[PDB]
């Protein structure tokens, strides 16, 4: 909030800004999402399995 003068009265300035970091770092604001708290979802899914014995 900052007041600024002119020759006729005062004018009010206000600025509101939203911080974007969610992946990582600084870390400054925390990693979860704010308003709708999202489910961070990785993916892997493969199989090629068949029976065999492999000696080590």
């Amino acid at each position: 909030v900052r007041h600024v003068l002119l020759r006729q009265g005062v004018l009010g300035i206000k600025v509101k800004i939203m911080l974007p970091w969610d992946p990582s770092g600084k870390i400054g604001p925390k990693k979860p999402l704010p308003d709708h708290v999202s489910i961070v979802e990785p993916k892997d899914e493969i199989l090629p399995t068949t029976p065999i014995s492999e000696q080590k």
């Binding site: 199989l47 399995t49 068949t50 029976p51 065999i52 014995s53 492999e54 000696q55 080590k56």
Partner: protein, 313 residues
């Protein structure tokens, strides 16, 4: 002919039976674990009005007790629990000797060696680890380990050599030899995650099962895939017989007792058939263990009961 009669049923739990084991030193004891966060030591009367009474109840856990195993003397007892710790009991009044500190997640499987000097653990850490009886870490396995949760580990009876089984949810069975702590082999097989594995009393076999519910047979020392059998929907626990070459497979509505020579199903154990609907009309059977007599076997269910059976000729 060798067939099965329904012996009786025990009562004394508020949580699902997770495991049961029995020492051959005292077959007149029997030990149990459950998700009421206590392991119950029983007093077996052979009267058919009941079939046993709880003698004492060992207490002190903040989450489920997954697996339990007896000592070779029957004077100690050990537990693995989903609070990330283990306890070493003195099965005469209570009074834990030692609690084993160090895991970041659940301890699912646990087993107690023949010489009573080596104790292992399977964890959702994705680490097999070895434990001195003093309660400190002889070794930790973090290289060539499972890439998913460790389902069950076993100590193998052998001529003298050190071999231990390991199986995880990465659909593989790893066999480990101590004093190099290397992969003896990798066995590939089973679609879907592995629940259980168990070793023959002679020790040259590994009967494995899982989500697949198929019973594949492996050779410990030959390293060969013998064969596969259709064991039903899912098999959660397995246990060989001590006095036969049978194999007893725990499926949901029934227990399937299999003769191995030749390969055939002997009978299917059915419990009470009480009218209920529709998703699991009877409770699933989840654990099972033979008595050392080999006449009687026991079962763990999710209705908080242990059903008994007996072989009749």
């Amino acid at each position: 002919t060798e067939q099965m009669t329904l012996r009786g049923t025990l009562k004394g739990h508020n949580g699902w039976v997770t495991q049961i084991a029995t020492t051959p030193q005292f077959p007149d004891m029997i030990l149990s674990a459950s998700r009421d966060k206590t392991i119950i030591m029983w007093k077996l009367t052979r009267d058919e009005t009941n079939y046993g009474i709880p003698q004492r109840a060992l207490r002190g856990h903040s989450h489920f007790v997954s697996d339990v195993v007896i000592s070779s003397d029957g004077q100690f007892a050990l537990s693995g629990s989903w609070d990330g710790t283990l306890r070493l009991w003195d099965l005469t009044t209570g009074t834990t000797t030692r609690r084993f500190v160090g895991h970041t997640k659940d301890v699912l499987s646990v087993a107690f060696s023949s010489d009573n000097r080596q104790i292992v653990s399977g964890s959702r850490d994705k680490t097999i680890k070895l434990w001195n009886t003093l309660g400190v870490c002889k070794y930790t396995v973090q290289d060539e380990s499972h890439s998913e949760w460790v389902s069950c580990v076993r100590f193998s009876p052998n001529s003298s050599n050190p071999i231990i089984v390991s199986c995880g949810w990465d659909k593989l069975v790893k066999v480990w030899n101590l004093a190099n702590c290397k992969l003896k082999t990798n066995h590939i097989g089973h679609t879907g995650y592995l629940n259980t594995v168990t070793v023959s009393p002679d020790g040259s076999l590994c009967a494995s099962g899982g989500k697949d519910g198929q019973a594949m047979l492996w050779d410990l020392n030959e390293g060969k895939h013998l064969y596969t059998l259709d064991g039903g929907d899912i098999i959660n626990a397995l246990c060989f017989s001590p006095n036969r070459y049978w194999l007893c497979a725990a499926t949901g509505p029934s227990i399937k007792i299999w003769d191995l020579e030749g390969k055939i199903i002997v009978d299917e154990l059915k419990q009470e058939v009480i009218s209920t609907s529709s998703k699991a009309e009877p409770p699933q059977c989840t654990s099972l263990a033979w008595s050392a007599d080999g006449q009687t076997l026991f079962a763990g269910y999710t209705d908080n009961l242990v059903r008994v059976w007996q072989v009749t000729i």
